[PDB]
Structure 1
Amino acid sequence: PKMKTHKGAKKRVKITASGKVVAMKTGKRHLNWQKSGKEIRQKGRKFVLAKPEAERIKLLLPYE
């Protein structure tokens, strides 16, 4: 049967135009009161996943 899209991956990540894989930064979900503004600011960004972990998630999204 045709492959199914992983819905956990579809909701956490995006494949860019060139095939990079981009997700939100981790660490500002809670427990933020003592974190520096420099932290919360930088953690509100998007980042590129390491090549191996990126190549794996791309296979979970065969129809993107």
Structure 2
Amino acid sequence: PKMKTHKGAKKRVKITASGKVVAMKTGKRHLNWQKSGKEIRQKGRKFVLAKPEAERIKLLLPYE
């Protein structure tokens, strides 16, 4: 049968133009009050995943 896309993956990750995988930096969902402004802000930026894990994630989104 058709493979199914991992919905959890499609909700967390993005495939870029050139193949990279992209996600949101972890560690500002809570416990924020004491975290530095430098910390709090750097956790905005999307980050690129390291290839072996990115590549694995990729196989989970067959249709994109």
* TM interval, short-chain normalised: over 0.9
In the aligned structure 2, how far is the partner of 1:32 from the partner of 1:44? Answer: 13
Count of residues paired in the alignment: 64
Give the structure 2 partner of residue 40 of structure 1.
Answer: 40
TM (norm. structure 1) is: 0.99
* 1:2, distance to aligned residue in structure 2 (A): 0.7
Shift of the alpha carbon at 1:18?
A: 0.3
Distance 1:51 1:6 in 2: 18
Q: TM-score, normalised by structure 2?
A: 0.99
Deviation at 1:43, TM superposition (A): 0.5
* 1:27 Cα offset (Å): 0.1
- Which structure 2 residue ranges, 5 or more long, are not aligned? none
Q: Percent identity, aligned pairs only? A: 100
CA distance in 2 between partners of 1:25 and 1:5 (Å): 23
Corresponding residue SS for 1:30: coil
Q: How far 1:7 sits from its partner (Å)?
A: 0.2
Cα offset for 1:54? 0.3
Structure-2 separation of matches of 1:44 and 1:31:
16
